[PDB]
Design brief:
Layout (H helix, E strand, L loop, with lengths): L1 E4 L2 H10 L5 E6 L4 H16 L4 E6 L4 H6 L7 E6 L2 E7 L3 H11 L1
Parallel strand pairs: 1-3, 2-3
Antiparallel strand pairs: 2-4, 4-5
C-alpha cells in the first residue's frame, strides 16, 4: 500500500497514474528519528485510505526529487492532485497528517 519510489522517473509516473486521487508523499531519511516514529502510522493510513495514493521517498536515494520538491524538514509530507502541490508540512505529527488527508481528499 505504500509506493516505494527509487527514481524521478518513478515519482513522475506515480503522480500521473494517480489520476484524480490525492497523493501523499513522505520524504524521509534513515538518520531521522521522528521519521521512524511515524513510519508505521503512515503505512496504517495507506491501508485505511485505500483510495488515496501514498509514496515514500528517501531523500538520499532520490536526491533530484528531494531537491526539486524543495524539501527542508525531515520528515516532510507533501500533497498532490493532478501533479500540482496542494499542501505541505513538516514534522512527524500524526493527527495533522490524517487531518490534512481528510481536508484534501
Amino acid at each position: 500500500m505504500v509506493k516505494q519510489i527509487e527514481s524521478k522517473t518513478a515519482f513522475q509516473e506515480a503522480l500521473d497514474a494517480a489520476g484524480d486521487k490525492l497523493v501523499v508523499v513522505d520524504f524521509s531519511a534513515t538518520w531521522c528519528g521522528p521519521c521512524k516514529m511515524i513510519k508505521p502510522f503512515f503505512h496504517s493510513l495507506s491501508e485505511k485510505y485505500s483510495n488515496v495514493i501514498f509514496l515514500e521517498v528517501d531523500v538520499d536515494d532520490c536526491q533530484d526529487v528531494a531537491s526539486e520538491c524543495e524539501v527542508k524538514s525531515m520528515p516532510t509530507f507533501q500533497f498532490f492532485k493532478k501533479g500540482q502541490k496542494v499542501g505541505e508540512f513538516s514534522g512527524a505529527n500524526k493527527e495533522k497528517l490524517e487531518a490534512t488527508i481528510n481536508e484534501l481528499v
